[PDB]
């Protein structure tokens, strides 16, 4: 598999976190994976020409769509799941929850499950 790490990017500030030495703050495999997941979720699909069709999501395009509330919930689940699952490190993403707090303003939750979260059988002959 041999996945590798990356450098932190504080999305709150929109800038790379750098040590006092001036070098960018290196991060572990899982940290880089989480950063990539957030970036891919924030990246629209088919629109940023630097990427292939695999990368990105289509959540923003869904806002203008005319599908119903539950249809939009299913579309959000499908879009987030498809966007995340391209990464090899991903095992499963699910347990989606939704809360239409105001009349038409939504909050949704999801769980991402890693390949390392798998459970291994213990046996040998």
């Amino acid at each position: 598999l041999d996945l590798k790490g990356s450098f932190l990017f504080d999305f709150e500030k929109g800038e790379f976190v750098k040590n006092a030495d001036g070098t960018l703050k290196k991060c572990d495999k899982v940290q880089a994976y989480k950063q990539w997941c957030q970036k891919a979720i924030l990246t629209p699909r088919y629109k940023k020409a630097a990427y292939t069709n695999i990368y990105g999501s289509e959540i923003k395009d869904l806002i203008a769509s005319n599908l119903s509330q539950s249809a939009k919930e299913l579309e959000i689940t499908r879009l987030i799941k498809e966007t995340i699952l391209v990464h090899p490190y991903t095992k499963e993403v699910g347990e989606f929850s939704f809360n239409w707090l105001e009349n038409s303003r939504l909050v949704e939750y999801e769980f991402d499950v890693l390949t390392i979260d798998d459970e291994n059988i213990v046996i040998d002959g």
Binding site: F9, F11, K13, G14, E15, F16, L24, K39, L42, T43, K48, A49, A50
Partner: protein
């Protein structure tokens, strides 16, 4: 903010997270500056492929046609010399000879087709005048004319 046009395009081609990222903005500003320089260099290269807009490639063109390469000379003079040298490879009809000499001098020329048995006349016309030295024109005419013909000249402002 990025100053380079190509830098802005390349940054916008990536994910939108880099609005506030000074680091990536500076990086792609530098890359866009490099690509702008490369595009200008490409246009300059497009100029070098011809003798009319040879510019610093006029040295290459002169070396190609065997003319003496001398940077101190006027660029337009070098262009005229190169064009005249290139155009000397066909029949010395009055049209071709007249245009060759016109290209070399840069002033309008009308070949008289002189009345005498084996001479041809050349008449020059320049609104800006001429310098006091035009010997190289006579040298080129002697080299380029048919061997058995003589030549006469007159110049007009």
């Amino acid at each position: 903010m990025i100053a380079s046009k190509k830098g802005k395009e390349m940054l916008l081609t990536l994910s939108p997270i880099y609005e506030q990222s000074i680091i990536m903005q500076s990086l792609y500003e530098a890359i866009g500056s490099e690509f702008d320089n490369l595009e200008l260099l490409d246009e300059e290269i497009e100029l070098q492929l011809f003798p009319q807009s040879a510019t610093w490639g006029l040295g290459f063109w002169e070396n190609r046609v065997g003319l003496i390469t001398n940077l101190d000379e006027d660029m337009e003079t070098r262009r005229r010399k190169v064009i005249a040298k290139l155009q000397s490879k066909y029949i010395m009809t009055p049209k071709r000879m007249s245009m060759i000499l016109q290209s070399y001098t840069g002033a309008n020329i009308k070949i008289n087709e002189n009345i005498s048995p084996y001479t041809f006349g050349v008449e020059l016309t320049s609104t800006q005048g001429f310098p006091k030295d035009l010997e190289d024109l006579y040298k080129r005419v002697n080299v380029i004319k048919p061997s058995h013909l003589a030549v006469s000249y007159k110049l007009v402002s």
